[PDB]
């Protein structure tokens, strides 16, 4: 079945580094250079064997035709009001990018306001971030090219959608916040650097600053408002309070949910914004999260996890700011995570909880924190919402495994609230009633109970005969909640698959303690939880090891790669997208220094000893047992992935092919695909998304010999 030869890849046997006394060889270190002829030649050599492997089977074209048919459904965001006008995003089904529309009212005709599809021939220029002026009359928007995290911020006057001269460069991980006087906007930029800044470089990003751009001026005139030259990893994002009076500055360092909170009372600036602001350092440590909700005069409401791993709402009065004086507006729940909170219609709060990995949505009184209204949802996720302090209505969008969006609307000026379906879409093609979603909790190695969702056709026999696609992430306090994926439903319907999503530790499903039980010294908990989910699916007869595929992206690509190394007997197929594979060196490149809050950093001997045991690059090993080989493996990455630089996947595949691929017992393929004009995933055009899932499922179908079910 393997009609190709792995390319010959030079090993630099002199690349030896001492970590705390332990010598580590890195013979493919030269792949760290994205611009060398050698690296480009390796990528071309790998794509040359991967592409014909994936395309050779007719199943890919059947999958792509079906994905193109079933993904072609209208997709909408919530409506949102800005000034006198409503806006929403909309895709007729297959456009590369969704289009921003504007209307003068809800019953009014809609016009195209911003169509990113016209900015490139191939849909690889995407909107990334935007901010309307407080009165809704002006509009700032970030554009990214080829999926790079780099952004150019541009500006428009809303009435007539008139392009303005203002352009801001060197923007990345940036806030966008206009002052309420309409004069100009806060944003973040990084200093000049040598070499490229287009997403193909690996250069570390440090010394991010906060600037204020005055509309109608050149970027060279912008005001430096905050900088941390003795703390190069600090990132300070600005936002205005709802009354326009205070700039709040959230300073982060790494990815934990914590921040400093400094404020500037703009009434106390003698001369407007002319230099470094008069910051009051309200919270001047990284012990807790303080996420601004609203304020009334000097009484600020924040969502926090300060001594509340499931999060709660507190009121901090700037004129009586000592911690013993804070008021607890909505106390922490014993188990449910308060995920986010919005203030709407002056004195309402909308609170979204996660209860056993499903959202609930509640309305509360701002003054007392009392529950006023439950917004009833089916089982799934709230994935979009609109409703700010000045608005008198909300919209929110619900999704699940089996249903594409429902958008709800509620007019909050009414004495008796009636939330109503505002928009619902139906995918013709899949009968949702043919499938079920179950949630179960399975004991991990240490006995901890882990949630997992399983989606399958009703009536199946649990005789172990079904291919399965098990997904995990496990990290960064990210919760993996139900979402509609027509790509995965094609696997169910047309490949007879079972889908599974394991809510392993490292995620935020059960708050900061869930997150803590899968980071740093406990990172191996994520892997053990994920391997246990696989053994549960096998033991319960959903699938068998040879029919089981696992998949994860980024930190989830680290998850599945490490699982391939640790339990190659457990999986038939592994797809790792944009994975972090070199755990010893991740912190050196672009923004990777920020991940040491989850992983640790190999500069410390203690952290090094955790990382070396699971780092995918350093744990490739031929299974000892004569009858065990590695699963079939496919790594997917792209040449502008400046979030997780692609050298991770390049070095990993070189190593798989050399150590495992060369052996006689290995007959499962070990392949990489590197895409062009794309990056970590955000803003990827629909045409590339379709190509990507087509590759994944053709790899699966070919590797497991799965028949298409028309």
């Amino acid at each position: 079945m393997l009609s190709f030869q792995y390319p010959d890849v030079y090993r630099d046997e002199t690349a030896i580094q001492d970590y705390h006394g332990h010598k580590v060889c890195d013979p493919y270190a030269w792949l760290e250079d994205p611009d060398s002829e050698q690296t480009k030649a390796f990528v071309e050599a790998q794509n040359k064997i991967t592409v014909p492997f994936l395309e050779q089977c007719p199943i890919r074209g059947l999958y792509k035709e079906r994905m193109t048919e079933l993904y072609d459904y209208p997709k909408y965001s919530c409506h949102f009001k800005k000034g006198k006008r409503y806006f929403y995003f909309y895709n007729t089904g297959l456009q590369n990018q969704r289009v921003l529309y504007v209307q003068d009212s809800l019953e009014g005709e809609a016009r195209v306001f911003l169509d990113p599809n016209i900015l490139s021939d191939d849909g690889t220029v995407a909107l990334r971030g935007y901010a309307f002026s407080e009165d809704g009359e002006y509009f700032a928007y970030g554009l990214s090219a080829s999926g790079s995290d780099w952004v150019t911020i541009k500006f428009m006057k809303v009435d007539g959608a008139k392009e303005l001269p203002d352009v801001l460069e060197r923007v990345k991980f940036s806030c966008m916040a206009w002052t309420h006087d309409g004069k100009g906007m806060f944003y973040n930029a990084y200093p000049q650097q040598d070499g490229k800044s287009d997403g193909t470089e690996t250069s570390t990003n440090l010394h991010q600053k906060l600037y204020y751009h005055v509309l109608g001026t050149d970027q060279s005139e912008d005001i430096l408002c905050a900088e941390f030259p003795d703390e190069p990893k600090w990132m300070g994002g600005a936002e205005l309070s709802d009354d326009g009076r205070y700039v709040l500055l959230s300073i982060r360092e790494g990815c934990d949910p914590v921040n400093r909170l400094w404020y500037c009372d703009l009434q106390q600036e003698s001369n407007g914004i002319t230099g470094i602001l008069k910051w009051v350092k309200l919270i001047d440590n990284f012990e807790g999260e303080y996420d601004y909700v609203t304020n009334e005069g000097t009484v600020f409401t924040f969502k926090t996890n300060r001594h509340s791993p499931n999060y709660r709402l507190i009121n901090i009065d700037f004129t009586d700011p000592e911690e013993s004086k804070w008021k607890v507006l909505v106390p922490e729940h014993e188990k449910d995570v308060l995920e986010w909170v919005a203030c709407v219609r002056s004195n309402f709060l909308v609170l979204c909880y996660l209860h056993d990995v499903k959202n609930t949505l509640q309305l509360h009184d701002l003054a007392t924190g009392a529950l006023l209204k439950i917004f009833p949802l089916e089982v799934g996720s709230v994935v979009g919402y609109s409703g700010q302090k000045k608005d008198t209505e909300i919209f929110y969008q619900f999704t699940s495994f089996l249903s594409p969006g429902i958008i709800y609307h509620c007019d909050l000026t009414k004495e008796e609230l009636e939330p109503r379906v505002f928009r619902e879409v139906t995918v013709k093609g899949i009968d949702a009633s043919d499938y079920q979603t179950v949630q179960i909790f399975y004991p991990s190695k240490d006995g901890t109970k882990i949630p997992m969702f399983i989606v399958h056709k009703k009536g199946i026999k649990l005789d172990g005969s079904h291919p399965a696609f098990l997904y995990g992430y496990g990290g960064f306090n990210i919760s993996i909640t139900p979402n509609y994926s027509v790509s995965r439903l094609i696997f169910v319907r047309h490949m007879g698959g079972v889908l599974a999503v394991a809510n392993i530790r490292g995620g935020g499903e059960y708050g900061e303690t869930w997150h803590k039980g899968g980071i740093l010294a406990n990172k191996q908990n994520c892997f053990d939880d994920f391997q246990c989910a696989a053994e549960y699916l096998i033991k319960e007869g959903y699938t068998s090891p040879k029919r089981l595929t696992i998949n994860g992206g980024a930190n989830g690509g680290l998850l599945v790669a490490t699982c391939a190394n640790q339990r190659p007997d457990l999986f038939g197929c592994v797809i790792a997208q944009v994975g972090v594979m070199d755990m010893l060196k991740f912190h050196k490149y672009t923004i990777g220094h920020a991940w040491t809050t989850d992983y640790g950093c190999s500069d410390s001997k203690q952290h090094f000893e955790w990382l070396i045991k699971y780092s995918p690059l350093h744990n490739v090993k031929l299974p000892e047992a004569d009858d065990i080989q590695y699963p079939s493996m496919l790594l997917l990455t792209a040449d502008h992935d400046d979030r997780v630089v692609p050298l991770h996947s390049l070095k990993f595949i070189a190593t798989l092919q050399y150590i495992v691929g060369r052996s006689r017992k290995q007959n499962n393929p070990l392949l990489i695909h590197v895409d062009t004009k794309a990056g970590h995933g955000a803003g990827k055009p629909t045409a590339k998304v379709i190509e990507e899932v087509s590759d994944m499922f053709a790899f699966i179908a070919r590797c497991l010999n799965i028949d298409w079910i028309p």
Partner: peptide, 4 residues
């Protein structure tokens, strides 16, 4: 967001 700048998580992996």
């Amino acid at each position: 967001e700048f998580s992996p």
